[PDB]
Amino acid sequence: HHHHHHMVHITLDRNTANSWLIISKDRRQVRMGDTHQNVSDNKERFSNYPMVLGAQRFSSGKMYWEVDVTQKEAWDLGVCRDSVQRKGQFSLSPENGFWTIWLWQDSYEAGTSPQTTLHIQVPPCQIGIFVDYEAGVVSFYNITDHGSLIYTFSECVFAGPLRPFFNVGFNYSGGNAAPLKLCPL
Ligand SMILES: O=C(NC1CC1)c1ccc2c(c1)OCO2
DSSP states (O other): OOOGGGBOOOOBOGGGSOTTEEEOTTSOEEEEOSSOOSOOOOTTSOSSSSEEEBSOOBSSSEEEEEEEOTTOSOEEEEEEETTOOOSSOOOOOGGGTEEEEEEETTEEEEOOSSOEEOOOSSOOSEEEEEEETTTTEEEEEEGGGTTEEEEEEOSOOOOSOEEEEEEOOOOSSSSOOOOEEEOOO
16 A cells, blocks of 8 residues: 555553553553553543543544554454443444454454454554545555555544544453554654
8 A cells, every 4th residue: 555654643542541551651552451550530431341542633634553463362453433432331333433443263353233354364463544534434454464455444424533443452361461552653
């Protein structure tokens, strides 16, 4: 792809984080802690899942960023409406304000309703995310495989400002402790 020149510097918003997440000083890395991280509760925090938002809000234009997923067994990545539900149980779907892909139990799927099987021959270590606000497109790229297309959501109805979205996943197995990292431009 040729989206690299729309690169944006994403930082994580601590105030939205599940209370078990540990965000680095530079706000560019996040991992699951083994306990509550001693923060107060607030109405912004994702309560049920190990999720966090980027601080940046997008309402126009073309945006691109990259995320490192090396050695993780489970994660969700993409973009969501600023006003998505934070508390309780919910599914990742465009109807609920999410445009995401994930890894779970050795398969990759797009967060459509119902979910869509992805066809990845080279397991990605870094994922590129492209948003075209005006066109209503969210695309995902396999940086490990020379930028090959993973998935395109088209005819997106954003219906609000967008935020970068992250889920580091649970670590019930002891094999999913590694962080998500925002990769340098
Ligand atoms: O963004 C949407 N779909 C495209 C990404 C694939 C989308 C979101 C909400 C809807 C909807 C469609 O239809 C009725 O409520």
